[PDB]
């Protein structure tokens with residue numbers, strides 16, 4: 053078949069999210085600065101740009117036109133062993149998002165790395181994956197990943213999928229989502 | 240769909256094989272011992288056990304009942320940047336395979352790591368992937384990976400796919416494949 057996104061969503065889960073999402077809050081809390089910080093939503097915000105593409109660095113990128121996103125630091129790495137072929141250490145980037153004159157938020161943001169395969173495929177093998185087929189596979193990927201994560205009780209409340217057009221301001225998008233998150237002061 | 244193997248094969252290529260296979264021989268040649276060694280076939284032997292499962296360490300495992308396989312060392316790591324979400328260093332394991340009283344072979348062997356996802360899926364989500372459906376997906380994975388690698392001229396002659404039942408002796412299998420490889424003395 054040509055439905056690559058199904059396999060991409062399942063391996064993204066079993067090769068990564070299944071074991072980092074339940075532990076993310078605990079990993080974050082290993083750092084005193086992160087324990088001390090309020091307005092630090094502890095969910096992984098998984099970024100899904102509709103064009104499967106991004107600038108390697110989020111702060112100041114085309115998705116951050118107002119330069120309101122700042123890299124703060126990394127979480128304490130988690131150790132995980134599977135198959136012994138190659139070793140795996142997992143860590144995440146914490147960002148600060150300005151909220152006007154108020155206290156800025158901290159959050160975890162990461163592009164959905166399987167989108168790289170959709171992008172690479174559309175550029176190197178256009179006969180296998182047209183631009184339009186890639187657009188559709190992003191949606192398949194999104195809906196399958198949703199089904200997978202919603203079926204795992206250990207992942208509940210630990211992530212948020214963020215879909216956006218490359219024309220949108222990620223700082224504005226994230227700010228709205230952070231304000232809408234369940235986390236309250238002292239939570 | 241439920242055809243996860245297609246996506247597994249494509250991301251295995253774009254996320255890994257596409258850039259390690261063309262460079263493998265050159266990476267190997269960075270180590271004097273490996274330059275000096277004869278009977279060192281430079282292809283990556285990609286191991287595809289039909290049950291999608293393996294002991295983390297190949298030497299002395301259930302696939303090596305005669306203990307003829309020995310870990311020799313790792314290749315010099317390759318640097319590759321993609322997406323900036325997480326950093327990537329790639330290296331491979333070199334093994335010695337005994338050939339009776341003759342000079343033993345050196346080779347590169349690696350289990351096909353996407354099989355871990357097929358296995359994990361069959362165990363954690365049997366309703367999604369039955370044992371019998373998993374068996375079939377291994378074959379789909381194999382044939383799709385074959386199509387992908389054979390379509391890339393830069394990968395030609397750089398790999399060999401090795402399929403086998405868990406009852407077979409991997410040392411015996413590898414020995415025949417090494418002898419059948421194109422490499423000649425001084426090559």
Ligand SMILES: Nc1nc2c(ncn2[C@@H]2O[C@@H]3COP(=O)(O)O[C@H]4[C@@H](O)[C@H](n5cnc6c(N)ncnc65)O[C@@H]4COP(=O)(O)O[C@H]3[C@H]2O)c(=O)[nH]1
Nearest residue numbers: 063064067068137138165166250251254255324325352353
């Ligand atoms: N033997 C070997 N196999 C590798 C290596 N790197 C990747 N692979 C294999 O290709 C598959 C796709 O790699 P990807 O990096 O493009 O997608 C990755 C990546 O999109 C995501 N992921 C894994 N670790 C991540 C991380 N630390 N950060 C962000 N995303 C991550 O999970 C996906 C699937 O991981 P995986 O281990 O199950 O499958 C790999 C794996 O089977 C490697 O270095 N050695």
